[PDB]
């Protein structure tokens, strides 16, 4: 709703690639631009400071350059340990501001997802709510669309998605869509379907079931 910071943008690259992240800084005189690297669950780490200076302990593949107003961070040879999120920082008018965030992602061939749809457990129907989940296991790219169909009617607003972090070796992703319904609305319909579309799927894959086998 009220987002305080945009989500990190994505960049698909392979190991050994040369990447260059540009940071548009209208405060060029404030050439104190600093670059940071952050991995999931860890605190950010300083890489480039003062536009071009290399921080003590950072590998030599990292470099920073300034061309007028544009500040860039260049990784000469992308390594498996370099796939993370990168932030640009600008100091202006006594205010420090971080960039949007660039998540460098491992690039691989397209992989179609494996779809599984799980009816709710009878202990939950006794509680008064029904939760049908749909599993999208091991796919690439992470862009996937999940459409819930109740009695061949397209749903919207009664589900929530959750995508895992990229696998280190498979470079794959996993999605879990949870359709939450009430005990009364669940018992009023029979067929509940989970339609999945992906780049690796020439046609949408539907995994469905009937209430009560």
């Amino acid at each position: 709703d009220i987002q305080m910071t945009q989500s990190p943008s994505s960049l698909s690259a392979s190991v050994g690639d040369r990447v260059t992240i540009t940071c548009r800084a209208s405060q060029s005189v404030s050439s104190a631009v600093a670059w940071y690297q952050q991995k999931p669950g860890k605190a950010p780490k300083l890489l480039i400071y003062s536009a071009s200076s290399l921080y003590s302990g950072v590998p030599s593949r990292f470099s920073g350059s300034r061309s007028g107003t544009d500040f860039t961070l260049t990784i000469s040879s992308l390594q498996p340990e370099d796939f993370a999120t990168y932030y640009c920082q600008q100091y202006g008018s006594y205010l420090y501001t971080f960039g949007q965030g660039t998540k460098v992602e491992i690039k691989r061939t397209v992989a179609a997802p494996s779809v599984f749809i799980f009816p709710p457990s009878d202990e939950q129907l006794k509680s008064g709510t029904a939760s049908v989940v749909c599993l999208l296991n091991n796919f690439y790219p992470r862009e996937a669309k999940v459409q819930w169909k109740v009695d061949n009617a397209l749903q919207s607003g009664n589900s929530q998605e959750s995508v895992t972090e990229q696998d280190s070796k498979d470079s794959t992703y996993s999605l879990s869509s949870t359709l939450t319904l009430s005990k009364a609305d669940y018992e009023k319909h029979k067929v509940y379907a989970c339609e999945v579309t992906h780049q690796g799927l020439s046609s949408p894959v539907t995994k469905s079931f009937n209430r009560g086998e």
Binding site: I2, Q3, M4, T5, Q6, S7, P8, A32, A34, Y36, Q38, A43, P44, K45, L46, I48, Y49, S50, S53, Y55, T85, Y87, Q89, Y91, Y94, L95, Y96, T97, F98, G99, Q100, G101, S114, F116, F118, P119, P120, S121, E123, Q124, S127, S131, V133, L135, N137, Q160, E161, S162, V163, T164, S174, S176, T178, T180, E213
Partner: protein, 221 residues
């Protein structure tokens, strides 16, 4: 070795207050600049405040001005961040960072050199509720899992078979339902032949509420 340790975070109600402390080691925070940077779940970093005890100057981000006050105590080498009138959008992992003293007037800012591990602050009117774990029925290799639902606050650690089953597990990031409670799923991919002999029980761990749940998964009739 310089170390920054955050503390004080946790559960707070909207409109309530919280005071974080950034205990520092390995250096004197007096001549240096202490900063607070927060990161919403799945979002980017946001600088919120900067303090310099030598000059006493306090600078805040416009999103926290008037509600957040930064300060320090040189007697214990610890900085503080008092948050008043907290809103739900203030829910984030709060890091405290150090900026070196201005030794060169040309390279006046040399980046946030060292950071802390961060402390989580959750602003919500929900109460600490224990997780309600439900089994995901498993219909060449089959997929099964557990659905933990209606727990608050984050996080929840989920293991399988007392930490013995790790190959193929997928503990998804939690989602915030409209009821203010969190709900995540943890699935796994185990051969269908070992579904009858080998028992599969997920160990659901919620430390905020001290609720251990071990739910077994079996195919329905």
């Amino acid at each position: 070795e310089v170390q920054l340790v955050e503390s004080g975070g946790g559960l707070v109600q909207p409109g309530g207050s919280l005071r974080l402390s950034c205990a520092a080691s390995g250096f004197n925070i007096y001549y240096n600049y202490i900063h607070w940077v927060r990161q919403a779940p799945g979002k980017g970093l946001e600088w919120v405040a900067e303090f310099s005890p030598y000059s006493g100057s306090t600078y805040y981000a416009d999103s926290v001005k008037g509600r957040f006050t930064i300060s320090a105590d040189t007697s214990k080498n610890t900085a503080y961040l008092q948050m008043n009138s907290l809103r739900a959008e203030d829910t984030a992992v709060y890091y405290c960072a150090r900026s070196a003293a201005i030794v060169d007037w040309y390279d006046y800012f040399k980046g946030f050199d060292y950071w802390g591990q961060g402390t989580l602050v959750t602003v919500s009117s929900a109460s600490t509720k224990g997780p309600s774990v439900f089994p995901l029925a498993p219909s060449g290799t089959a997929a099964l899992g557990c659905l933990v639902k209606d727990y608050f606050p984050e996080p929840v650690t989920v293991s399988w078979n007392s930490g013995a089953l790790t190959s193929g597990v997928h503990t998804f990031p939690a989602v915030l339902q409209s009821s203010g409670l969190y709900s995540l799923s943890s699935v796994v991919t185990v051969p269908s032949s070992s579904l009858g002999t080998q028992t599969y029980i997920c160990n659901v761990n919620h430390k905020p509420s001290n609720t251990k749940v071990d739910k077994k998964v079996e195919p329905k009739s």
